[PDB]
Amino acid sequence: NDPQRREKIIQATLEAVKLYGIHAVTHRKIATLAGVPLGSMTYYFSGIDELLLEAFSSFTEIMSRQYQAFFSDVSDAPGACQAITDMIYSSQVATPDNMELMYQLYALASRKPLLKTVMQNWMQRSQQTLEQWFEPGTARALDAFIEGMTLHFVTDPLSREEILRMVERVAGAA
Amino acid sequence: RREKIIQATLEAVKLYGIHAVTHRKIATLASMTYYFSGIDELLLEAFSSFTEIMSRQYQAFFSDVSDAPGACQAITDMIYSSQVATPDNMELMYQLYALASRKPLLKTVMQNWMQRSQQTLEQWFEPGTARALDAFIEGMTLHFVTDRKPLSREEILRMVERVAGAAAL
């Protein structure tokens, strides 16, 4: 079955999306990107749509891990305000490759429900992280504020000390 | 008859993909090579016009607001309204954000929008609070599109008032 080469194909599909367009993603294009035979495409996946769904799925699991990374050294809610600030301060550069792919996924999800399922599982994770030090009502508000705050750079402001003080107000703690 | 073309472009974009869009698939959805020559032209014009009408309506939501508490109620209504439905043009918006990252004129038109929304909220809130309110608003509608567990009007208003802090009258 060869799990590593299945992973490669998903990697190469993702790479074939950020590079050219999802409209352009074909079996041949991905196989030549993955350095793999045409047959492996049909052996592992039932169709381009299962493949795209898996690649987007894996893209969001990457993000989730890039997300909970910021909470490595967080014991407490005050440290969690700091990690949130770090994350919003740090991801002001770069690159809008992920964010570009992600806004593509938000819009596509509103008319492809398998993809919406994947989006939901991705946000469950973010909220679950925050609930380690906040109650859901605060976790939910902080998640939304983090997501909106990130947008407000993808168009283009603003100091760490200032980002921290907005976070601290959305959290009201300590 | 540019508006037919402008809305066809917007309709095509939302009706199956961005890059997908062709000068024909647009043409059937409402001169093309003659009026509006470049297919990317076109998107710029459609998205600009879209961004201007979106920005105007958001402002208009606050037309009868006189004060900060009123403004917290208005924001809560707007956020709750977006959750019980989900607005017409939220896909085009996420598409917009995707293009803004790649093409600088859409970054600039988007930029002009964000300061429009902030200028409204600055009529009652300090720009730090106005900035946080705008981001909270944007991030909340993004969450709706997915769709997380629904929030009551009561929960949103409590959240909005926290983010506004003082005033609260």
Curated annotation (Swiss-Prot), chain A:
Which GO terms fall under biological process for this protein?
DNA-templated transcription; positive regulation of DNA-templated transcription
Q: Which SUPFAM superfamilies match?
A: Homeodomain-like, Tetracyclin repressor-like, C-terminal domain
HTH tetR-type domain: which residues? Answer: 3-63
Query: Quick check: keyword Transcription in the entry?
Result: yes
Q: Identify the PROSITE patterns for this entry.
A: HTH_TETR_2 (PS50977)
Q: Where are the transmembrane segments?
A: none
Q: Does the keyword Methyltransferase apply?
A: no
Disulfide linkages recorded for this protein, renumbered to the chain, are none
Q: Which UniProt keywords apply?
A: DNA-binding, Transcription, Transcription regulation
* Binding region for DNA: 26-45
Molecular functions (GO terms)? DNA binding; DNA-binding transcription factor activity
So which domain of life are we looking at?
Bacteria
Q: What induces it?
A: Autoregulated.
Any further remarks? Answer: Has a strong cooperative DNA-binding mode, leading to aggregation of RcdA-DNA complexes.
Role of this protein:
Regulates the expression of a number of genes involved in biofilm formation and stress response. Target genes include six stress-response transcriptional regulators: csgD, which is a master regulator of biofilm formation, appY, sxy, ycgF, fimB and rcdA itself. This indicates that a large number of genes must be regulated indirectly via these transcriptional regulators. Acts by binding to the upstream region of its target genes.
- Protein's name in the database: HTH-type transcriptional regulator RcdA
- The source organism is Escherichia coli (strain K12)
Swiss-Prot record, chain B:
Where is the secretion signal located? Answer: none
Please report the stretch or stretches of sequence annotated as the HTH tetR-type domain: 1-54
| Keywords per UniProt | DNA-binding, Transcription, Transcription regulation
Please give the positions of the paired cysteines in each disulfide bond. Answer: none
Molecular function as annotated in GO: DNA binding; DNA-binding transcription factor activity
Supply the PROSITE patterns for this chain.
HTH_TETR_2 (PS50977)
> Per its UniProt record, what Pfam families does this chain match?
TetR_C_31 (PF17940), TetR_N (PF00440)
Please verify whether the record's keywords include Membrane. no
Q: Which terms under GO biological process does the entry name?
A: DNA-templated transcription; positive regulation of DNA-templated transcription
Q: Which residues bind DNA?
A: 22-36
The record's InterPro entries line, in alphabetical order, gives: Homeodomain-like_sf, HTH_TetR, Tet_transcr_reg_TetR-rel_C_sf, TetR_C_31
Induction section of the entry? Autoregulated.
Q: Does the keyword DNA-binding apply?
A: yes
Organism superkingdom: Bacteria
Function field: Regulates the expression of a number of genes involved in biofilm formation and stress response. Target genes include six stress-response transcriptional regulators: csgD, which is a master regulator of biofilm formation, appY, sxy, ycgF, fimB and rcdA itself. This indicates that a large number of genes must be regulated indirectly via these transcriptional regulators. Acts by binding to the upstream region of its target genes.
The extra comment attached to this record reads: Has a strong cooperative DNA-binding mode, leading to aggregation of RcdA-DNA complexes.
Give the protein's recorded name. HTH-type transcriptional regulator RcdA
- From the UniProt record, report the name of the gene that encodes this protein: rcdA
